[PDB]
Design a protein around this ligand. Structure first.
Ligand SMILES: [Mg+2]
Ligand SMILES: [Mg+2]
Ligand SMILES: [Mg+2]
Ligand SMILES: [Mg+2]
Ligand SMILES: [Mg+2]
Ligand SMILES: [Mg+2]
Ligand SMILES: [Mg+2]
Ligand SMILES: [Mg+2]
Ligand SMILES: [Mg+2]
Ligand SMILES: [Mg+2]
Ligand SMILES: [Mg+2]
Ligand SMILES: [Mg+2]
Ligand SMILES: [Mg+2]
Length: 290
């Protein structure tokens, strides 16, 4: 019943995925995106400095999915990361890793392009991983890489997933991730940011993720989070800490979209209530002292 040998080919891989997905009550494409992200994460985890410490830390929706599992996280499409080396090093090192492969998977990477960002001195980079399994195209993963901000690569959490185990690929999964205080600081900054009026802030989904991150801090001391929030807001030199969690007129349905699949969790059910919850979190962070 549990596969004793790895999938012999793509078709066998897809067949085992659909079985696992049906078995777990998960959408096939969701499980497939998760497995592909994991494979890319394993490539990224081979990138170390000359002391063996990670060069790339995972963040964003991939991190939340690793922290909470598929049933308890938003569907997201990006593999978002933070690097401690230049993009040119990162892209070249990833391409090598993807050529060497991992457990039958290989990847080729499109070229990095810069993206518009006002608070980062170094512009983020974005490209794509074309994944294959035993020679045959398998999946596409959008990748984003941003440079360090303040202390947000000083430490990392190491998370895992058994999804590849469940389809007969047993090699341990271990993914270095940006820690929760920095995920909170960056999402709080993004969800409260005011953009230039050609552009509009659509990040209502960050209100969902911020509730999930507050839940994951449990009763932790908030002081590291407060320090991280201060550091990110001062570093970006835009709106000041503590921000106001405002809602824009088009956010009600975006927030509703972001709740898809999470009916079983205790989340704010309306964007107003979500803004109120995250504002209370902001105040709670700001109160921290010891
Ligand atoms: Mg096949
Ligand atoms: Mg299914
Ligand atoms: Mg390092
Ligand atoms: Mg994800
Ligand atoms: Mg992903
Ligand atoms: Mg710092
Ligand atoms: Mg193992
Ligand atoms: Mg705003
Ligand atoms: Mg609504
Ligand atoms: Mg969403
Ligand atoms: Mg729901
Ligand atoms: Mg609820
Ligand atoms: Mg409130």
């Amino acid at each position: 019943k549990p596969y004793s040998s790895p999938p012999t080919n793509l078709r066998s891989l897809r067949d085992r995925l659909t079985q696992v997905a049906e078995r777990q009550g998960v959408v096939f494409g969701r499980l497939q995106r998760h497995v592909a992200m994991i494979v890319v994460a394993q490539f990224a985890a081979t990138l170390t400095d000359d002391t063996g410490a990670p060069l790339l830390l995972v963040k964003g929706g991939s991190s939340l999915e690793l922290r909470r599992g598929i049933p308890d996280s938003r569907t997201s499409k990006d593999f978002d990361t933070v690097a401690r080396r230049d993009i040119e090093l990162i892209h070249e090192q990833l391409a090598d890793a993807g050529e060497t492969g991992w457990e039958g998977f290989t990847a080729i990477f499109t070229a990095p392009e810069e993206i518009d960002v006002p608070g980062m001195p170094v512009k983020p980079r974005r490209f794509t991983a074309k994944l294959s399994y035993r020679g045959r195209a398998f999946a596409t993963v959008p990748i984003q890489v941003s440079s360090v901000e303040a202390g947000n690569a000083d430490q990392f959490d190491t998370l895992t997933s058994d999804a590849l185990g469940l389809v007969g690929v047993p090699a341990a999964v271990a993914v270095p991730c940006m820690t929760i205080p920095w995920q909170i600081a960056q999402k709080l900054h993004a969800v409260t940011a005011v953009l230039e009026e050609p552009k509009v802030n659509d990040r209502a989904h960050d209100l969902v993720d911020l509730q999930l991150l507050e839940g994951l801090l449990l009763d932790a001391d908030l002081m590291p989070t407060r320090s991280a929030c201060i550091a990110i807001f001062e570093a970006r030199a835009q709106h000041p800490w503590p921000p106001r969690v405002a809602t824009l007129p088009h956010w009600p349905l975006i927030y509703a979209g972001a709740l898809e699949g999470l009916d079983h969790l205790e989340l704010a059910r309306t964007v107003d209530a979500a803004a109120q919850a995250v504002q209370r979190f902001v105040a709670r962070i700001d109160r921290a002292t010891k």
